[PDB]
C-alpha cells in the first residue's frame, strides 16, 4: 500500500507556503532600495565579501553531506545516517556562528536596526533565515534522538528524507538572498 508518500506531500506544500513568507520579506527589501538614490548602501555600511563567501560554501557542503546521509538512509543503515547528519549539523552550526560574528562586526561599526532604512531590511532579511536554520538544526537533533530509541523502519526513512529537503529549501533560499544582497546590490 501507500504508493505515494503522505508526509512528503505535506512537507512540500508547507515549503511552498514558507516560500511565500520569504516573498513578503523580499518585497519589503526591494522596496526602499528604489528610494535610496546613489550610494544606496548608506554612510557607514560596507559588506565583507571575504567573510560572506566561506559560509555559503560551507552551507552547500552541508547540503551535499545531507544528501549523502539520505543515500545512507534509503538502505537500512542507521549508523551512516547518524554520521552524515552529525556532520551536517556541525556545518550548519558553523554557518550560524559565522553569521553571528558578521552581525557583531557590522553592528559595532555603524549599521543597526534602528539606525537606518538599510540596516532594518538587511537584518530582517537575514535574521529570519538564520531562525529557519536554527529550526533545521533542532529538527536534526530530534531526528537523531528518535533514531536512537527504536528499530529503524520506513517511517524513520521518510522522516530523514523530509528533513533533508527542508534543509535543501533553506539552502536555496540562502543562495537567493546572498546573490541578491552581495552581488546584485
Amino acid at each position: 500500500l501507500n504508493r505515494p508518500n503522505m508526509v512528503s506531500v505535506g512537507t512540500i506544500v508547507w515549503l511552498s507556503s514558507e516560500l511565500m513568507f520569504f516573498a513578503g520579506l523580499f518585497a519589503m527589501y526591494f522596496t526602499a532600495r528604489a528610494q535610496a538614490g546613489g550610494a544606496w548602501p548608506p554612510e557607514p555600511t560596507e559588506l565583507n565579501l571575504a567573510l560572506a563567501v566561506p559560509v555559503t560554501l560551507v552551507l552547500i557542503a552541508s547540503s551535499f553531506t545531507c544528501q549523502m546521509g539520505v543515500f545512507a538512509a534509503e538502505r537500512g543503515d542507521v549508523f551512516g545516517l547518524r554520521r552524515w547528519y552529525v556532520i551536517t549539523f556541525l556545518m550548519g552550526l558553523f554557518f550560524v556562528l559565522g553569521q553571528g560574528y558578521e552581525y557583531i562586526h557590522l553592528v559595532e561599526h555603524g549599521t543597526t536596526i534602528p539606525g537606518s532604512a538599510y540596516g532594518s531590511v538587511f537584518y530582517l532579511a537575514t535574521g529570519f533565515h538564520g531562525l529557519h536554520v536554527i529550526g533545521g538544526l533542532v529538527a536534526f537533533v530530534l531526528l537523531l534522538a528518535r533514531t536512537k530509541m527504536s528499530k529503524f523502519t520506513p517511517a524513520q526513512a521518510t522522516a530523514a528524507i523530509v528533513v533533508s529537503y527542508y534543509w535543501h529549501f533553506v539552502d536555496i533560499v540562502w543562495i537567493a538572498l546572498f546573490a541578491t544582497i552581495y552581488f546584485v546590490r
Binding site: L1, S16, M20, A23, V138, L142, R146, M149
Partner: protein
C-alpha cells in the same frame, strides 16, 4: 496523479503570464516605474505552484495506476492495510499553550517570557515527536 499535476500546471502558467505582463506594464506607463511589490509576490506565487506541480509530476511519472485513479476499479481492489493514524493525544493543546505564551511575551515586550515560551515550545514539540517511539522503561 495526473489531474493534480495538471491543475497545478494550469495555475503555474496563468500566474507566470500575469507576473510577466504586470512587470512589463509597470516598467512602462507607471508613475515610478516597476512596482517591486506585486511583481515579487506574483513571481514567488508562480514559484510556489511550480514547486508543487513539479513534485507531483515527478511522482506521477514513476507510479502505477492507483485504484482511485482508475474507473472500473472495484472496492475489493483497495482491500488491504492503510497507514498509521494516531488515536488520542494531548500534546497539541500544550504546543498551542506554549506558542501562545511566546506570542504574549512578544506582544508585551518581555524577553524572559519569550525565552520561557520558546523553551516550552521545544519541550512540547519533543513530546509530540517522541510519543509513539519511547520504549518501555528500563527499571
Amino acid at each position: 496523479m495526473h489531474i493534480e499535476a495538471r491543475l497545478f500546471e494550469i495555475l503555474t502558467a496563468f500566474f507566470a503570464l500575469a507576473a510577466v505582463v504586470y512587470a512589463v506594464l509597470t516598467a512602462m506607463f507607471a508613475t515610478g516605474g516597476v512596482e517591486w511589490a506585486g511583481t515579487t509576490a506574483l513571481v514567488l506565487t508562480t514559484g510556489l505552484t511550480l514547486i508543487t506541480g513539479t513534485f507531483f509530476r515527478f511522482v506521477a511519472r514513476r507510479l502505477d495506476t492507483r485504484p482511485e485513479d482508475y474507473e472500473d476499479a472495484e472496492i475489493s481492489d483497495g482491500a488491504g492495510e492503510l497507514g498509521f493514524f494516531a488515536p488520542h493525544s494531548w500534546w497539541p493543546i500544550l504546543i498551542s499553550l506554549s506558542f501562545s505564551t511566546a506570542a504574549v511575551g512578544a506582544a508585551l515586550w518581555l524577553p524572559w517570557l519569550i525565552a520561557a515560551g520558546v523553551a516550552f515550545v521545544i519541550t512540547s514539540v519533543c513530546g509530540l515527536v517522541f510519543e509513539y517511539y519511547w520504549g518501555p522503561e528500563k527499571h
